[PDB]
């Protein structure tokens, strides 16, 4: 990958954690009788989360846990189209930094009344947050650093790229 | 991967098949000397192509096509993707085209915003379902008219999580 300073997480290390991590929702959501007509509502945050999404979705599947998805856009401009009221969401992040952009999605599907609401995020940033908040699934924890990749961008470019990249420095 | 559906094609042989697409894409595209900063636009058409737009971004990125991603859900959301096309590739990718109302209908809104050039790759091809004339460059697979769930694809929004293609029967 020739703009990449370095790999960060290859392809295969992202869909071993995520799949753990797709073990440990259904456990926690087993108490909750989930079905077809009342699933998990994983709630794609577009654009970056979409790969994220596509593969998380298919653990789940793997898991025996029935989704359904919704897409949405703040960076609002695209609502959930199903009624969330009384239902199972979760919000569904690439990458999670000062987490004002969390924040302030998480206030907002708050107020549409869901039976639960719950965050997975794959690459948290800790070290960078200027609010606190809740993240109950952040998959993999990393150092400040621009990434790319995995559906991630800079300027628009390499989203489509497999591993989790840091841009080189220009 | 519920009682009353028949798998029809797996993960293994779509990701295959999408593969090969890539190939022909990149080979087809090669006179045209995309770069990051002028790259292969993939219009993914929300929600049903959300799986097989993030895994052909992956298989356009093993064969070195840059890619850039926007979201339609067919005023707002398809306006603003509409007038940023003018004068880039622009690719529509869509999961299933039957009667190919849809897909005209999409087509003729990019077109009026004059992109370099459209070209539309589909999952799943329904030709016997046609009521207008389109072009479709990129046929994945081609089928009868059967009702199809999986890889993205949903009943009532159910079991777009499915890894593999499946037919529900009458
Ligand atoms: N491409 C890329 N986006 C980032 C990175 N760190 C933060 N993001 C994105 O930048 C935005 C701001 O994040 P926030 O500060 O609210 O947590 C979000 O859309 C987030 O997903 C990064 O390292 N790479
Ligand atoms: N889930 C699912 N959607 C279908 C199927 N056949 C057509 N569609 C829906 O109808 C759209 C295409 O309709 P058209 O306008 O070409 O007749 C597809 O994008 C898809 O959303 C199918 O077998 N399964």
Redesign the interface.
């Given at each position: 990958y020739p703009?990449s300073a370095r790999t960060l997480v290859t392809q295969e290390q992202v869909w071993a954690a995520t799949a753990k991590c797709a073990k440990k929702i259904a456990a926690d959501y087993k108490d909750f009788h989930l079905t077809?007509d009342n699933?998990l509502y994983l709630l794609?945050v577009?654009?970056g989360s979409?790969?994220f999404?596509?593969?998380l979705?298919?653990f789940?599947?793997?898991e025996g846990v029935?989704?359904?998805?919704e897409?949405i856009?703040a960076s609002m401009?695209?609502d959930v189209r199903?009624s969330v009221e009384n239902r199972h969401i979760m919000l569904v992040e690439d990458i999670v930094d000062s987490a004002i952009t969390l924040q302030y999605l998480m206030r907002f599907m708050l107020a549409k009344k869901p039976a639960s609401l719950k965050t997975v995020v794959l690459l948290d940033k800790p070290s960078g947050r200027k609010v606190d908040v809740l993240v109950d699934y952040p998959v993999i924890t990393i150092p400040r650093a621009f990434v790319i990749g995995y559906?991630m961008?800079f300027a628009?470019?390499?989203?489509?790229?497999?591993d989790i990249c840091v841009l080189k420095k220009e």
């Open positions: 703009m077809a699933p794609c577009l654009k979409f790969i999404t596509a593969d979705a298919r789940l599947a793997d029935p989704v359904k998805v897409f856009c401009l695209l199903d559906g961008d628009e470019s390499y989203r489509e790229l497999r």
